[PDB]
Structure 1
Amino acid sequence: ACDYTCGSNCYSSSDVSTAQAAGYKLHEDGETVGSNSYPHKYNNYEGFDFSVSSPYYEYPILSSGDVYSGGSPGADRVVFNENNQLAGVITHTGASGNNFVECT
């Protein structure tokens, strides 16, 4: 079953964890990836009440199970922070425009 459902996409905790490890890794060395430069800051225009502290950084999570290294970032994101803590998993799918909704 799914630990996170982002629209059609099914993720296990192992998935979330692998994207989160890449994102904080790039984030530690001050390196980016893609034409949108992931990882980058997540502002929270949304207003989600994360259990975890600011500030946040987002990084694509791929439906393929592959870790993102460029190309289409897809619709799903993993939100973490300076402490390497999972804030949550969000998605543009089902969200109006470039808005985000949370993965269930």
Structure 2
Amino acid sequence: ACDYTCGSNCYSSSDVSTAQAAGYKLHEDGETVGSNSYPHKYNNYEGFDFSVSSPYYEWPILSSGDVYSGGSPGADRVVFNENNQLAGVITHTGASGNNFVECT
């Protein structure tokens, strides 16, 4: 069964830790990838009650199992903080426009 289900996409904890480790080292290195320049700040417009503190950063998580390296980010994201603490897994899947909803 899925630890996080983003629409139709299924992720285990391992998938999430892997994406997150990747996202956080580029953040620490001040490196960005992709046309959207990931990882980038996540403002939490949605108002998600995360149990970890701000600021937050979002990094894509791919259904392929591959780590993001440019190209299309897909609709799923891992949100981590400055301490490299997981805040949550979110998606545009099922959200209207560029809004986000949590992955279950």
* Fold shared by both chains (TM-score > 0.5): yes
Identical-residue share of aligned pairs (%):
99
CA-atom RMSD in angstroms: 0.3
Shift of 1:23: 0.4
* Length, aligned pairs only: 104
Shift of 1:34: 0.5
Is the partner of 2:32 in helix, strand or coil? coil
- Please say if 1:6 is aligned against 2:1: no
- In structure 2, C-alpha distance between the alignment counterparts of 1:51 and 1:11, rounded to whole Å: 20
Q: Deviations over 1:9-45 (max 9, x none)?
A: 0000000000000000000010000011000000000
Q: Deviations over 1:36-90 (max 9, x none)?
A: 1000000000000000000000000000000000000000000000000000000
Structure 1: where are the runs of 5+ without partners? Answer: none
Shift of 1:6: 0.1
- In structure 1, C-alpha distance between the alignment counterparts of 2:49 and 2:37, rounded to whole Å: 25
The 4+ residue runs of structure 1 with deviation greater than 4 A are none
TM norm structure 1: 0.99
TM norm structure 2: 0.99
